[PDB]
Write a protein that binds this ligand. Structure first.
Ligand SMILES: *[C]C1=C([C])[C]=C2C(=[C]1)N([C][C]([O])[C]([O])[C]([O])[C]OP([O])(=O)OP([O])(=O)O[C][C]1O[C](N3[C]=NC4=C3N=[C]N=C4[N])[C]([O])[C]1[O])C1=NC(=O)[N]C(=O)C1=N2[C]/[C]=[C]/N1[C][C][C]([C][C]C2=[C][C]=C([C]([C])[C])[C]=[C]2)[C][C]1
Ligand SMILES: *[C]C1=C([C])[C]=C2C(=[C]1)N([C][C]([O])[C]([O])[C]([O])[C]OP([O])(=O)OP([O])(=O)O[C][C]1O[C](N3[C]=NC4=C3N=[C]N=C4[N])[C]([O])[C]1[O])C1=NC(=O)[N]C(=O)C1=N2[C]/[C]=[C]/N1[C][C][C]([C][C]C2=[C][C]=C([C]([C])[C])[C]=[C]2)[C][C]1
Ligand SMILES: CCCCCCCCCCCC[N+](C)(C)CCCS(=O)(=O)O
Ligand SMILES: CCCCCCCCCCCC[N+](C)(C)CCCS(=O)(=O)O
Lengths: 499, 494
């Protein structure tokens, strides 16, 4: 019935918010739609897999908040396997390699690839993390799809094909669906292209021992009965002195403030009294989440390692169901598995098939890519289509179509009376990730501690001590990388020499 | 409690649907979220204006369904004033003209303008009304914004800006926000460029005496207590034998079938059990409505008519709050008024101002465009900002961003078990309009009649005889208009 703060949503962001508010001495309630906590994280446990992350999974250096929270809850990380060679599969052939980026040999193509990555990071520096709409050319770039930007930037089909896969794989959406400004922002607020695509020294370095669902579960364990499962919030009323929050099972909750810790667009499921302001009213109809199926195929052994393949595959091609894989063998070396993502329009297309038809298509793909018949001998298959989740909307996160971030962006985390906004979408560092869920959750919580006069204004946004378990190597460039010309730059050098 | 069919939404679409079902002998309830019916139509009455449509208002030839329904409810139309000259205001000067399309004098610009309009209708001829995702070039056109298309097509800044205005005005969104495929479909399913922009012999030819809101009020009058106001639906359950529909005020309604007659995205305000199929679950997050403020300034007299202006203004440029006006004077010659739309980003921007501040800006603009100090002396002002409506989400209608129509368009009017889908968005002729809303409510109702055994499959989609009161004249083109080259075509001859 009565408390200080009601948190709507029991994902990482909600549970991080509640935990901070509870640790500070307030009475909180977490209202959670599903029969479980975790949200876009979910750890399945059976005898065939022991445990497996069907949602959010990877962490890495610079993600210091999620690592501190996980460690405070008694969790440990382990390194994803990147000992052996990565594979770049393009035009029906596999090309093994080492280091984060697939190499390229053709000099024209080398210049175009170098310039693509460099330009992403170049445009990124123009874009404030905390206010993307303030970039000097915010409008010009927001009025563009990533597709249009790649049509202008990539002078080779090789670079354009790889850039297309990068977008799809990073934001589970087509290049023609997303704003260039938004995408550039998203990449920059993760710390740049190298940080986001890397396993070693980047976003995919590590997983938690026993799965990421433990984060939410263990916070629930601290909060006891304060967490209420199967409580979909339908109604928020701010007309009176106390905020009244109504659930679908006809319960009433009464509070001083509310944290909305749900994907922006899932805000549409709540009826508001009084109505939301114009700008938030339209914003939450303009921000969908991407489309992805996560698939894990299990095998007797990690046979690929024996061929000096770490199990990372970067798979270009329309025929290919999966575009990216990682090794998902346990750190012990057992329950050998390949993890892969089916992305964007391929999630739409291939969801029409049965579980068994998807397994077959993956095994056949893996067989060709790894040059192994063993890939046709799976011992188990687990999967989750995030597109069919009423209380997620999709995965990994919310993307912004063209025109939306400059017009509506500033209201994402603008409080509405005594409603405050968390969720990873509201973060300024690794928004989209579990890291961003923790940042947004703790920031939202502290916004309320300020409103209550319990902390000063400068303690709302709090920096995070670098992890001592997972320290960050800095991102370096070479002289050549920095100064080699673009393709158009070389053409200008050719027109000038011959004059 | 118990009935044959629950309709969610008491806009024109819901009401048209409920009326049809009720007339055929079924017990229908209409659940409406607001304290009124009409939805994106709303007629305000006061002594100062008498009545004024603050939402959907205009009807015209080929919109035979809204005309027939309205005629049956005892409503009549009158012609929007277009006797005198239109005005195109470009680079701070007023150019009077007659006929639907503002003229062009420079030969190059001329070729370019001619090519733009012709090209929208050519592209449209390859888009099926009932299935735009089947256009031969569906994917290629769906993956561009209308900004990209206009950048390719328009060789002059003049044509690019008039085409940008055209997009902004028709679908209340920016060229860069919308799929080219969707926009081309939209125009095509209204009968082409000429039909959609024309007052005489087009979509803006007529209004309803007493206001459009009478359509819904009078259907509510016919259904009596069967319409439940302030009943926002929150929960639809199809697990059991009958469908259970729950409202925010806690009431339980039980039925054999449901019609959802709300804008697709407002589907998100409903919790479903079992959950929605994947494709609809994502669709309803990907389909916003435009942004618009409708503004009506009242004057002592229709003074513009003294200067041989009809009150139609087409106003180029960023600085103008309003890009388009019509005469909103009553047919009797009184309650003189000018109606203007503040579109898209200008709606987001100018909404921060006060009502008085908007009125001042509009009056100063009209003074300049009409070239008259009489515009500075308004006697009254009414406006509505549809962006702020929880239960509309905007106006006029839902637009499709790049990528969505081809990927999710199929799911729009596909039944989900015992839920059938109406609303103007699901129509195939004048979707987006009150005509659309009628077509879709009556279709959705007739789908339920078929599921129930009462009518054959071939009677779900019913043609409509032409209104005798509002006949359509044919759309024609000249020989020059059809065969004059584009700018690039003139250059491939040189
Ligand atoms: C789904 C997913 C997946 C599948 C995956 C992933 C993910 C996801 N992610 C994301 C995460 O998970 C997120 O972020 C989080 O979790 C979020 O959180 P929050 O914020 O908390 O939210 P949520 O969870 O959702 O929660 C919510 C809640 O609430 C509720 N509700 C609703 N409604 C309602 C409610 N309640 C009450 N009432 C109402 N009404 C619900 O239920 C819930 O509970 C992630 N993240 C991280 O961190 N990690 C990971 O891993 C993840 N994942 C992902 C991945 C990604 N990626 C990255 C990138 C990569 C790629 C790279 C590359 C590129 C390129 C290249 C070239 C070739 C060179 C390479 C590489 C991939 C991966
Ligand atoms: C808003 C608006 C405005 C402002 C305006 C307009 C409009 C609108 N429109 C549209 C209409 O209105 C529509 O379509 C209709 O109405 C719709 O219907 P429906 O479908 O039925 O829907 P609604 O109404 O929305 O309803 C729904 C209902 O539901 C409810 N709910 C929700 N949720 C819920 C519920 N319930 C229960 N539960 C739940 N959950 C609600 O409440 C409601 O009630 C229109 N239309 C027509 O027809 N007309 C008109 O007028 C209109 N308007 C408009 C405008 C138009 N435009 C056209 C075009 C023009 C332009 C021309 C031109 C262009 C260019 C040129 C150059 C320069 C050359 C020229 C010219 C403008 C105008
Ligand atoms: C003749 C030039 C070929 C176009 C090459 N692409 C990369 C397609 C476009 C360059 C765009 S931009 O010119 O740099 O704006
Ligand atoms: C010159 N513009 C109009 C910029 C493009 C010409 C169109 S085209 O793409 O070159 O056919």
């Amino acid at each position: 019935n009565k408390c200080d703060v009601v948190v709507v949503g029991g994902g990482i962001s909600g549970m991080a918010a509640a935990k901070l508010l509870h640790d500070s001495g307030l009475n909180v309630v977490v209202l959670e739609a599903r029969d479980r906590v975790g949200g876009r994280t979910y750890t399945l446990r059976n005898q065939k897999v022991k445990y497996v992350d069907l949602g959010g999974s990877y962490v890495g250096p610079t993600q210091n908040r999620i690592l501190r929270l996980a460690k405070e809850l008694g969790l440990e990380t382990y390194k994803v396997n990147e000992v052996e060679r990565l594979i770049h599969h393009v035009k029906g052939k596999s090309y093994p390699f080492r280091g984060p980026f697939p190499p390229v040999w053709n000099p024209i193509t080398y210049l175009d690839h170098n310039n693509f990555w460099r330009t992403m990071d170049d445009m990124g520096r123009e874009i404030p993390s905390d206010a993307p709409w303030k970039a000097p050319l915010a409008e010009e770039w927001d009025n563009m799809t990533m597709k249009e930007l790649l049509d202008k930037l990539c002078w080779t089909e090789s670079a354009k094909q790889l850039a297309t896969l990068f977008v799809n794989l990073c934001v589970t959406a087509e290049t023609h669906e997303v704003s260039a400004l938004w995408f550039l922002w998203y990449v920059k607020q993760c710390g740049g292209t190298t940080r986001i695509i890397s396993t070693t020294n980047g976003g995919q370095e590590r997983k938690f021992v026993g799965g990421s669902g433990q984060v939410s579960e263990r916070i629930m364990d601290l909060l006891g009965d304060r967490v209420k499962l199967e409580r979909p919030v339908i109604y928020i009323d701010q007309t009176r002195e106390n905020v009244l929050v109504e659930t679908l099972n006809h319960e009433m909750y009464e509070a001083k403030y509310v944290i909305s810790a749900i994907p922006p667009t899932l805000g549409m499921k709540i009826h508001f009294n009084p109505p939301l302001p114009m700008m938030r009213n339209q914003m939450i109809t303009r921000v969908p989440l991407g489309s992805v199926i996560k698939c894990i195929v299990y095998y007797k052994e990690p046979f690929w390692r024996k061929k000096d393949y770490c199990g990372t595959m970067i798979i270009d091609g329309e025929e290919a169901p999966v575009a990216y894989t990682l090794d998902d063998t346990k750190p012990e070396g057992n329950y050998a598995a390949i993890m892969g993502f089916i992305l964007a329009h391929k999630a739409r297309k291939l969801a029409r098939l049965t579980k068994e038809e998807r397994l077959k298509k993956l095994c056949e793909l893996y067989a060709k890519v790894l040059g192994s018949l063993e890939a046709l001998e799976p011992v188990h298959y687990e999967e989750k289509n995030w597109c069919e989740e009423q209380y997620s909307g999709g995965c990994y996160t919310t993307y912004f179509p063209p025109g939306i971030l400059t017009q509506y962006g500033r209201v994402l985390r603008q409080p509405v009376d005594r409603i405050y906004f968390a969720g990873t979408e509201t973060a300024t560092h690794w928004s989209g990730y579990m890291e961003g869920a923790v940042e947004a959750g703790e920031r939202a919580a502290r916004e309320i501690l300020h409103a209550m006069g319990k902390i000063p204004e400068d303690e709302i946004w709090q920096s995070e001590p670098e992890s001592v378990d997972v320290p960050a190597q800095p991102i370096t460039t070479t002289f050549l990388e920095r100064h080699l010309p673009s393709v158009p730059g070389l053409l200008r050098l050719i027109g000038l020499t011959t004059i």
